[PDB]
Structures are given as structure tokens and as C-alpha cells.
From a paper:
The [name] PII-like signal transduction protein [name] was recently identified as a cyclic diadenylate monophosphate (c-di-AMP)-binding protein. Here, we present the crystal structures of the apo- and c-di-AMP-bound [name] protein, which is trimeric in solution as well as in the crystals. The structures combined with detailed bioinformatics analysis revealed that the protein belongs to a new family of proteins with a similar core fold but with distinct features to classical PII proteins, which usually function in nitrogen metabolism pathways in bacteria. The His-PstASA protein has a calculated mass of 13.9 kDa; however, SEC-MALs analysis revealed that the protein forms a 43.9 ± 0.84-kDa complex in solution suggesting that PstASA is trimeric in solution, similar to classical PII proteins.
The apo-[name] structure was solved using the deposited P. pentosaceus ATCC 25745 protein PEPE_1480 structure as a model, which belongs to the same protein family. Although the PstASA protein crystallized as a monomer in the asymmetric unit, upon inspection of the crystal packing it became clear that the protein forms trimers within the crystal lattice consistent with a trimeric state in solution. The PstASA monomer includes a core of four β-strands and two α-helices connected by two highly flexible loops. The amino acids from 34 to 40, which following the nomenclature for PII proteins will be referred to as T′-loop residues, and residues 68 to 92, which will be referred to as B′-loop residues, were not visible in the electron density maps indicating that these residues are disordered. In the apo-[name] structure both the T′- and B′-loops were unstructured, indicating that they are highly flexible in the nucleotide-free state. In the apo structure, the side chain of Arg-67 is not completely visible in the electron density maps suggesting that it is highly flexible. In the apo structure no salt bridge is observed, as only density for the Cβ is present for Arg-67. The main inter-monomer contacts in the PstASA trimer are provided by the interaction of β4, from one monomer with the C terminus of the neighboring monomer, through a network of hydrogen bonds. Inspection of the surface potential of the trimer highlighted a large, accessible, and positively charged area at the monomer-monomer interface, which, similar to the recently reported structure of the L. monocytogenes pyruvate carboxylase enzyme in complex with c-di-AMP, could serve as a potential nucleotide-binding site.
Numbering used by the authors:
A (entry chain A), B (entry chain A), C (entry chain A): 0 to 33, 41 to 67, 93 to 109
The structure:
Amino acid sequence: HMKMIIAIVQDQDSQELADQLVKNNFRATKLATTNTTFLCGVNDDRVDEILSVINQTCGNRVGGATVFVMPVDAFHQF
Amino acid sequence: HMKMIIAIVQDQDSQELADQLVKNNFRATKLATTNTTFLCGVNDDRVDEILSVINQTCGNRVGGATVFVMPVDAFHQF
Amino acid sequence: HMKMIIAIVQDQDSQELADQLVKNNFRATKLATTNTTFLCGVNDDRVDEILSVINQTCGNRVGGATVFVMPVDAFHQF
């Protein structure tokens, strides 16, 4: 099935996460906020991959990321 | 029980979805983004209805909608 | 485990909820909207506390709050 990622990432590191998610085939949506918030539905078995991306891009290096992995009952694509 | 809809819809079609959701008694919230993102808690047995609305308003006609249906453990109304 | 709160609160009462959540050790994120929308992952056994806060701050006194409590499969903190 599928999952929903809500990754709260720092704004300075938002630019590069946004670019690098694209390069890893991750379709994501940025909710503007000032500390930017991302939304990304990924496959059940691609959770470890996206978490790696978010960590390599942002976190305590300075930095800091907090992400939630949430269940999805249904996915539709019109 | 209840569900949560996260419908990522195109901005040109956001205006009309926003209006038409009201006409179908769907209380929804628009998170501004440029590709706008909607949030809408609907009843367990009104998922098919709202999906119809979103499709009739937006999708590949040009267009394109992507929606997630997510479980809700509790709903409160103060 | 943990939960995710999506609290749709009125804008006039958003300022004070935002301040008072901090005073109760609730790390939350505000998604700008005009009727503002909040996001807050809290512990499994701190749902009653945050609901109290939201009610004391906003609701029908004038007012009005609507909140969803949603399951979280995984929480990560980089």
C-alpha cells in the first residue's frame, strides 16, 4: 500500500531538499511557513529512502528535521 | 466514523473546486501553494461523493488531481 | 505511541493558541490560511491536554474550533 510523509524541515535547508526529492523521484508539496513544512505520499517500501534524503539534506550538522509517517487508506489519481 | 481528504489539485481548477465543494456541503480548507492543496474531513460514507466532485472539477481533460484518503481516530468540534 | 493533531481554529484566536501551546510544551506548526490551520504531533496520552488548551483558547464563546486526531505509524527526529 502507501504512506504519507509530513517532514518539518528548516527553511534554509528547504530549497535543497525540494531539489533533491525531485532527483530521487519523490513527488512532494511544500506548505509555506516561517520552518517550512513538506507533504509527500510515498510507497510503503520507500520510507527508508526518503528518510535518508531528508537526513542527508537537513538535520543537526545547526539544522534539524522532524518527520511523521502516517497511514493512508486510499490513494487516487485523476 | 470519519476520514480525512488531502486533495492536491491544480490552481486554475482550485477556484471552482472550492466553490463546488460548498454546494455539496463539504467543509474544506485551502492551503495556499504554487499547485494548491486542500484538506477536508468527510464522513466514512461520503468518500465516493467528494471524489466525484474533485474529478468533475479537475483532472486530465490539461488538468490533474491527486488525492489521499486517510484514517481519523478522533473528531472534535468546539 | 503518538498522534497527529490538525486543529482548524479561527484567526483572531490563532495568536493566543500559538502562544499558549508553547507554554504547555506543545511543538506545533501554523499553516497560514484565511481560518488558520495548525499541525501538532503529540503523545498518545497528551490528547486530552491539548484539546483542553484549544477549547480554552478558541470555540463558541463568537469563535469556533474543529480538530482531527490522526494515527501516526512512525515518528523520526533528525
